[PDB]
Design a protein around this ligand. Structure first.
Ligand code: DXY
Length: 205
């Protein structure tokens, strides 16, 4: 499966995703990284890895749908099968999300449905949970909604700060974002017509 990663900044987990695709039995290759912002770190990451990049500036388009249509055209041109979001900070239109339903994934640094929105690590600390984690899900029109693919629980430790908790959750993200991508890329996990996750046994052995 040919994979695009959409970013707006540092491309968190992009290196993890790249490294996973260079593994022997990988079902995925990262074929393009698209940013809505020029000269961000995540583009340098991609370029240093020899992966094509594009920059699409939302300010050049009349509205969100036209901007998203421009992203989609690039995805079309590069024959992309699957999209991962890695810190992409523009809300994608309903038509875009619909088109890519079951083929676009993202990650969140909580065990959803807990700690929706931004600053989930601070939310976890402020609330006083002892277990948090991260969640990879299919992207839906509504932020943080969408069917869950993989989750990993991560302990909150006595004395944790936003930074130390964040670093622990990031290590889990480095594990599950690529594992989830592999599941979707291989076809092992597919989104059913009923809108629920399906774990498929593949014909090819
Ligand atoms: C806080 S992390 C992220 C996750 C969004 C992944 C996502 C997505 N990008 N689009 C859709 N439809 N659904 C999604 O789940 C997020 C990204 C952007 C916003 C948001 O309000 N963005 C604003 C502008 C943000 C900016 O670029 O400054 C907008 O697009 O108008 C809110 C949340």
């Amino acid at each position: 499966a040919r994979v695009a990663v959409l970013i707006s900044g540092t491309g968190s987990n992009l290196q993890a995703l790249i490294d996973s695709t260079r593994e022997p039995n990988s079902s995925a290759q990262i074929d393009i990284v698209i940013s809505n912002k020029a000269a961000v770190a995540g583009l340098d990451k991609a370029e240093r890895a020899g992966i094509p990049t594009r920059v699409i500036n939302h300010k050049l388009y009349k509205n969100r749908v036209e901007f998203d249509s421009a992203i989609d055209l690039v995805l079309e041109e590069f024959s992309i099968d699957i999209v991962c979001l890695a810190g992409f900070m523009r809300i994608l239109s309903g038509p875009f999300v619909q088109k890519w339903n079951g083929k676009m994934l993202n990650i969140h640094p909580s065990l959803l449905p807990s700690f929706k929105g931004s600053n989930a690590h601070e939310q976890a600390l402020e609330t006083g949970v002892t277990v948090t984690g991260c969640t990879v899900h299919f992207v839906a029109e509504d932020v943080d909604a969408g069917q869950i693919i993989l989750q990993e629980a991560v302990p909150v430790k006595r004395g944790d700060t936003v930074a130390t908790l964040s670093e622990r959750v990031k290590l889990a993200e480095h594990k599950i974002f690529p594992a989830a991508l592999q599941l979707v890329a291989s076809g092992t996990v597919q989104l059913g017509e009923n809108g629920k996750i399906c774990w498929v046994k593949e014909e090819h052995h």
